[PDB]
């Protein structure tokens, strides 16, 4: 049904439109949603500013990275100390959180504005640019939180995994991008039939650039076992 | 059914058999059924194998040998239930003997039965059982 | 080893590394297992099992390696068959005597009888050479006793040391002392090993009559609950085998005495013995053995069972009720699992009845000449049940090639639903669905189906789902036996009563996939399957009927004219009309409606009169003289439910039929077809008469 | 192309002939000193058949050399090791295989 | 009929009496044994181990109950089987002159005042609420529960009810209730027409029939005693967010169960001689 | 069914629609009321 709204001097007999009344949360939520929107279009078109050319032309930066912490908060996970029913009753509105940020699409938006920064190795007055290691790592953080606990976003996201993997060895920020994969692929068994070869060869070739990372162990163990089954070929 | 003539049936359709699923030839079915002892004629083995593509599948084999086989069965059984009554020899049930064994476990429902069995069974009352037999099997 | 207990980093990465190398061999990877072999230094495992000095960490990581690399699979493939109880019938099975000597005490119940099947195992050498099969061998070996004498060793040290409350503890926790310590021991419990000269050691240990009554923490104790449970299990095998092992007795009392009372009656010259006549008559042999079981319930035999059932009435049971009662009481429990773990055995303690009542409707008696096909068979079905959980459909088509040559695949087919392997080949064909390993699937269950009746009834109880998957049958050759559709099919042919037993829904999806069909060559299969529900034994339902012609009158898609069109045009749309002939030609029966008016049969049969109006003569006359064998039958079954002799021979010939006696070649096809198509019109005459004995002439 | 130096000799000259189950400890490491097999450590008399030739090829030539009692070196080529690509989860590719065998029985 | 015919020539064809080679008959043996002989009475023992548990720091017995409120607690979409549950449901539920009025009274109150002490209504309440409209084994075994508990009518657990549904305020309870009511069952039109003619020929109708005696039998022990509180409650429901006037429903369902015994009628409104079948089922 | 406007990537969103089904529940199937009057704006709907 795109059943489309028009005005009209009669209209017809099921014009009874009803009503229902939403709730605090949700509300809250909504407004968070185009608040976030509407610092991140200004965000996007001051890195398209200093991108091209070099201008002074202005881009919003710590309100920006308040606003980032600020929604990092927002997505906490709740504790280890609360009633069980109390716990499940926040795990409830986060799952209802996630998922209404899922549907709004505001991953592609941050993934892009990822695409944006990830260009420079410290384009702008690099005094204002200072915390750009900062931003990005918060945003990796950020990534890392809408996830973990929907199945059906990771599996939904699992469609980018091949620019992730392509980006982990930028030696930079590559943690914060190991830690988003490993909680995507927990949680869906869909993406794990989605990796090939030659990432699994990307990530082995990471563990011999940076030392010996635990991390990546719990990640080739992951990538091993499903939630009950094993792959062979893996 | 018995375990051993299943047991044959299945070591001589392997033993004619070569590559071992389920595949011999049609015209190897001759060969089979007379290691097995059955030996109809040409136009009924053409009518088994029509009845069976150019593998003999193993299921269907052992249904069709199942008919065979109870066939006879079938004779011997109504020879020898009804050995059970009647010692003198004859195979002649009385109407009453009807009304009594009619009523035996397996179905025994109600008096519409017996009823339908007395009203045409030909009582002479000493009854010969092959009349009971073509009204039952249609 | 010993130096790296404060170096946290490097501790911390090779605890990972030993957890990566006992999750990449997780369940039968002998292939990878082998190299794991060549890595792990097989006595280095040895080496930590005794260290007293090491992590607690590495401690858990390798006998956790020890396990995943050498017992996994085993300890797997007695997990699965845990629960089977089949026991053949010898005289060793017979041996058995469900009790110590006409005690008052129970058996303690590490006994050796063990009559039971209990599937076994083999081992590869990890030596690098050629391949021998080597990687896909059954798994790589390992000492035995060795592991038996030093775990026993280090069970009796770890009791008695840990029971003092030392403030040591190997791994600084005791959880790191016992938790890996029990688990090994749990695994190896399992696998046949420790005997009855050690099993008297460990239930001296922990029976007396200790362990059980020290202090632990949690996993400690839900490690305990396992090996307690697996006990409880023992308890019920050893008591299944007693009980056959008293059948073999008790049986062939019942078959002298029916047989010797038979002949009793049968000796006798003296109505009154047909009663007995009717009591030797039951349906099979099953309410023969009702009638003999139900008459002990309220001849001197029937005192031997009235002796038995109290036999088998059945103190571990009670110390059990003590415990997880006192463990609940003491010491206030997280972890919902333990909790779990802890009100199973509790109530299962109790319901032993219950679980005998689980447990008897699995075992079985098979007798001793076919043992080897039965422990080959069940091998190969653990090893598919064991690929449930996964280059795999080759493996898969390995063993149902294997599963589909087994005389006790016949010889018991009550065994086969008795394993409930039918479903577990179901659940495989639904995680392939969202390859031709459906097509093996759907050919094995298909094979299966028409193995007795009963079966039948099992594979019906999945209809529901099967229709749902309909689109996977479509244009290939292997298509019959291949379809889900086709295996629904097979879930009908024979049963009337199975046949009145489905529903209307089924049939709405089968017509909603039906009305797709606006154009196919797939709906010719819908309609065979159709024709399966609606006729099912020489003579129609009428139930099915109705609701089938109903849903066709909604839509059935000059249509007569249409046939009739492109013969000469690719065998698609011909089949398709005559299956939808065929289909509707199987409603109105005469039983219901010559011999009397029934009301809505009239409006039914009146409905097809409406449909078709007797033009299907022109196809008649059209086909016999050229799609020749087939499509005239099924116009003549058309014609002769729903459609005097004037008008019978203005029907006119077999005279194409004669002409062909000796040169044929599908026309050798209708040859004996319209000997049994063309016997329907018992109920130009002399020019019939004619070609009727020169076709006589043709088979004198 | 295998370099056998006589480690500890048996008695030089019984070398076995075809059709002969051959009993060995063998404990090979790599070239590198990295240790990968070991008949010795899982306590295993290794057997096989010259002849039959399942064991690789430098081994086999080493089978027909050693004596009875005999322990020796057979250095190996990693053309005649599982090869260029080596086995598949143990040997690298191209390594070039050290051992340590003791031929000890016959049949 | 027709196949009937062909079962009294199978029935003279099992002329194989007790040839039944060795161990066929041994394996029919066990199956009418455990068929017809192991259904017996130990089932005194749930007095003595809801007694056992309640020996005293929580009760063990309030460790279970407490267990089954979280796992009902979480959130599956679907509830699981789960025969823990469907054993200890019916462990619980089996443990339920003027002077022997006024015993009976009071050992029944004691028994009630074993459970209701240990939040046990509310793992009933809340595992109604979890499945939605499904009916499975699970709420029956609820059910029985939830029946043998308010048997006599206790007030404390009626008021112990409408205060959890006062403070953790759900629809999805009422909304469950609506969607069990929906269906439970009707009679037949059809169906016995079939199961008729199939046990005719061969040698159920109201397989959902005595949840709904239970599941009515439980709404009526909720208004015994006259809570007109929580009799008002079910009709308008104010502290939720959406209402759902449970009475209209219940109405419905008896207007359905009526229509349906009316059919019934026509279809013997004319041969007037009713079978065993007919009658047992009416 | 619910007031709706449609999804993520478009108009810039601009259009108006109907949608029945789970849209409803979601984000953009919601609506702030205002009204003319600064002062009692939170009041009762008449």
């Known amino acids: 049904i795109q059943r489309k709204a028009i005005m009209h001097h009669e209209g017809h007999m099921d014009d009874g439109l009803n009503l229902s009344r939403s709730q605090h949360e949700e509300s809250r939520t909504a407004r968070v949603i185009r608040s976030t929107v509407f610092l991140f279009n200004r965000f996007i078109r001051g890195l398209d500013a200093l991108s091209k050319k070099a201008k002074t032309v202005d881009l919003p930066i710590e309100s920006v990275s308040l606003s980032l912490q600020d929604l990092i908060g927002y997505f906490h996970p709740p504790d280890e100390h609360l009633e069980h029913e109390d716990k499940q009753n926040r795990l409830r509105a986060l799952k209802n959180r996630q998922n209404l940020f899922q549907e709004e699409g505001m991953i592609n938006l941050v993934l892009e504005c990822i695409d944006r920064l990830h260009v420079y190795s410290s384009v702008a007055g690099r005094e204002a640019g200072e915390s750009w290691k900062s931003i990005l790592n918060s945003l990796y953080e950020l990534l890392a939180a809408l996830i973990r606990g929907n199945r059906k976003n990771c599996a939904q996201f699992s469609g980018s995994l091949d620019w992730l993997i392509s980006r982990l060895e930028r030696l930079e920020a590559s943690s914060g991008i190991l830690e988003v994969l490993h909680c995507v692929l927990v949680e869906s068994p869909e993406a794990l039939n989605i990796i090939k070869e030659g990432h699994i060869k990307s990530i082995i070739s990471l563990l011999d650039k940076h030392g010996r990372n635990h991390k990546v162990l719990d990640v080739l163990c992951s990538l091993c076992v499903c939630h009950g089954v094993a792959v062979r070929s893996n | 059914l018995t375990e051993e003539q299943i047991a044959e049936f299945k070591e001589a359709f392997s033993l004619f058999d070569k590559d071992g699923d389920g595949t011999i ?110 009204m039952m099997t249609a | 080893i010993l130096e790296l207990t404060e170096q946290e980093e490097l501790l911390k990465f090779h605890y990972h590394t030993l957890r990566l190398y006992s999750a990449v061999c997780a369940l039968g990877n002998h292939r990878v297992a082998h190299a794991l072999c060549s890595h792990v230094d097989e006595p280095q495992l040895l080496y930590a099992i005794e260290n007293k000095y090491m992590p607690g960490l590495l401690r858990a990581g390798y006998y956790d390696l020890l396990i995943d690399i050498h017992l996994s699979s085993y300890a797997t493939a007695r997990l699965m068959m845990n629960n089977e109880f089949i026991v053949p019938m010898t005289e060793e099975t017979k041996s058995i005597t469900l009790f110590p000597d006409e005690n008052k005490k129970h058996g303690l119940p590490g006994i050796g009888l063990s009559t039971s099947l209990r599937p076994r195992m083999q081992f590869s050498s990890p030596s690098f050479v050629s391949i021998n099969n080597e990687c896909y061998q059954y798994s790589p070996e390992f000492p035995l006793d060795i592991l038996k004498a030093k775990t026993i060793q280090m069970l009796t040290e770890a009791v008695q040391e840990g029971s003092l409350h030392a403030r040591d503890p190997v791994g600084g926790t005791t959880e790191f002392l016992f938790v890996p310590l029990i688990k090994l021991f749990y695994t190896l419990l399992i696998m046949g090993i420790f005997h009855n000269e050690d099993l008297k050691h460990i239930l001296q240990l922990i029976e007396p009559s200790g362990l059980l009554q020290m202090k632990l923490p949690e996993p400690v104790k839900l490690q305990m609950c396992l090996l307690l449970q697996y006990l409880c299990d023992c308890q019920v095998r050893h008591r ?165 040559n087994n005389k006790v695949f016949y010889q018991h087919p009550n065994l086969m639903r008795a394993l409930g392997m039918h479903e577990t080949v179901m659940e495989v064909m639904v995680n392939v669905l969202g390859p031709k390993m459906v097509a093996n699937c759907c050919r094995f269950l298909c094979y299966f189906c028409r193995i007795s009746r009963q079966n039948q009834k099992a594979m019906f109880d999945h209809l529901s789902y099967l229709l749902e998957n309909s689109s996977v049958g479509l244009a290939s050759p292997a298509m019959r036996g291949s379809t889900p559709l086709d295996v629904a099919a097979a879930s009908v042919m024979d049963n009337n009563e199975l046949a009145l037993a489905l529903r209307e829904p089924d049939l709405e999806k089968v017509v909603r996939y039906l009305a797709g069909c606006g154009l196919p060559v797939e709906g010719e299969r819908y309609l065979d399957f159709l024709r399966f529900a609606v006729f099912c034994n020489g003579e129609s339902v009428e139930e099915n009927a109705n609701v089938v012609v109903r849903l066709l009158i909604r839509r059935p898609e000059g249509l007569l004219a249409a046939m009739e069109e492109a013969i000469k ?34 409006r039914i049969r009146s409905i097809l009169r409406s449909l078709i109006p007797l033009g299907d003569l022109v196809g008649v006359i059209s086909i016999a003289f050229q799609f020749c064998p087939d499509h005239k039958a099924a116009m003549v079954l058309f014609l002769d439910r729903v459609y005097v002799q004037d008008f019978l021979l203005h029907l006119l010939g077999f005279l194409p039929d004669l002409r062909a006696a000796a040169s044929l070649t599908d026309m050798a096809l209708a040859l004996n077809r319209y000997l049994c198509t063309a016997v329907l019109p018992l109920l130009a005459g002399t020019e019939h008469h004619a070609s009727l004995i020169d076709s006589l002439l043709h088979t004198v | 192309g295998v370099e056998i130096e006589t480690i500890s000799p048996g008695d030089g000259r019984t070398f076995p002939k075809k059709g002969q189950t051959c009993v060995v400890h063998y404990t090979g490491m790599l070239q590198n000193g990295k240790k990968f097999d070991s008949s010795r450590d899982r306590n295993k008399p290794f057997k096989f058949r010259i002849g039959k030739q399942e064991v690789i090829k430098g081994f086999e030539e080493g089978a027909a050399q050693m004596s009875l009692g005999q322990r020796a070196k057979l250095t190996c080529t990693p053309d005649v090791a599982y090869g260029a690509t080596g086995h598949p989860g143990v040997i690298p590719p191209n390594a070039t295989l050290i051992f340590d065998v003791e031929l000890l029985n016959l049949e | 009929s027709k196949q009937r015919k062909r079962a009294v020539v199978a029935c003279f064809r099992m002329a194989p009496l007790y040839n039944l080679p060795r161990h066929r008959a041994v394996n029919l043996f066990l199956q009418g044994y455990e068929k017809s002989w192991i259904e017996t009475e130990e089932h005194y023992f749930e007095d003595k181990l809801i007694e056992d548990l309640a020996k005293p720091r929580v009760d063990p017995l309030h460790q279970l109950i407490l267990l089954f409120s979280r796992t009902a607690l979480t959130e599956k979409c679907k509830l699981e089987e789960d025969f823990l549950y469907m054993a200890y449901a019916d462990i619980m539920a089996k443990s339920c002159s003027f002077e022997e009025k006024e015993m009976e009274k009071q050992k029944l109150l004691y028994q009630q005042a074993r459970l209701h002490d240990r939040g046990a209504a509310e793992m009933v309440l809340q595992t109604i609420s979890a499945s939605k409209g499904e009916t499975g084994p699970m709420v029956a075994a609820t059910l029985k529960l939830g029946i043998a508990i308010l048997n006599g009518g206790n007030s404390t657990v009626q008021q112990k009810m409408l205060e959890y549904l006062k403070e953790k305020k759900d629809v999805g309870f009422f909304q469950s209730l609506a969607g069990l009511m929906q269906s439970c069952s009707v009679l037949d039109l059809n169906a016995f027409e079939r199961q008729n003619k199939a046990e005719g020929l061969g040698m159920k109708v109201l397989q959902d029939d005595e949840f709904t005696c239970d599941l009515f039998r439980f709404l009526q022990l909720l208004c015994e005693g006259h809570n007109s509180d929580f009799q008002n409650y079910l009709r308008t429901q104010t502290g939720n967010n959406t209402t759902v006037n449970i009475i209209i429903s219940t109405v419905d369902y008896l207007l359905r169960v009526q229509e349906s015994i009316s059919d019934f009628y026509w279809y013997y409104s004319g041969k007037d001689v009713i079978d065993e079948q007919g009658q047992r089922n009416f | 069914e619910c007031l709706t406007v449609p999804s993520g990537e478009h108009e810039q969103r601009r259009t108006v629609h109907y949608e029945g089904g789970a849209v409803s529940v979601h984000a953009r199937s919601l609506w702030r009321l205002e009204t003319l009057r600064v002062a009692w704006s939170g009041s009762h709907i008449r």
């Open chain 3, 569 to 602: 045009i690719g065998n698609a749309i011909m089949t398709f009309y005559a299956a939808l002939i065929d289909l509707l030609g199987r409603c109105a029966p005469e039983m219901h409606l010559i011999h009397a008016a029934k009301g809505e049969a009239i």
């Open chain 2, 25 to 134: 030839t049609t015209k190897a079915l001759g060969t089979v059924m007379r290691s097995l002892g059955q030996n109809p004629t040409e136009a009924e083995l053409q009518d088994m194998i029509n009845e069976v593509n150019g593998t003999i599948d193993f299921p269907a084999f052992l249904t069709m040998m199942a008919r065979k086989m109870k066939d006879t069965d079938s004779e011997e059984e109504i020879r020898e239930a009804f050995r059970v009554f009647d010692k003198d020899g004859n195979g002649y049930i009385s109407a009453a003997a009807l009304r009594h064994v009619m009523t035996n476990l397996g179905e025994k429902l109600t008096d519409e039965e017996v009823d339908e069995m007395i009203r045409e069974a030909d009582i002479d009352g000493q009854v010969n059982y092959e009349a009971f037999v073509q």
């Open chain 3, 240 to 404: 299944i085998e007693a009980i056959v092992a008293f059948s073999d007795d008790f049986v062939a009392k019942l078959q002298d005495n029916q047989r010797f009372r038979y002949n009793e009656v049968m000796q006798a010259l003296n109505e009154c013995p047909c009663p007995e006549e009717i009591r030797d008559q039951l349906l099979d042999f099953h309410e023969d053995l009702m009638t003999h079981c139900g008459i002990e319930l309220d001849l001197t035999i029937r005192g031997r069972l009235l002796s038995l059932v109290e036999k088998v009435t059945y103190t571990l049971q009670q110390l059990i009720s003590e415990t997880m009662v006192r463990w609940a009481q003491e010491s206030v429990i997280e972890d919902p699992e333990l909790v779990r773990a802890m009100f199973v055995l509790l109530h299962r303690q109790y319901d032993g009845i219950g679980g005998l009542v689980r447990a008897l409707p699995k075992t079985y008696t098979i007798n001793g000449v076919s043992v080897e096909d039965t422990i080959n068979l069940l091998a190969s079905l653990g090893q598919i049940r064991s690929l449930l959980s996964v280059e795999e459909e080759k493996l898969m088509i390995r063993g149902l090639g294997d599963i589909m």
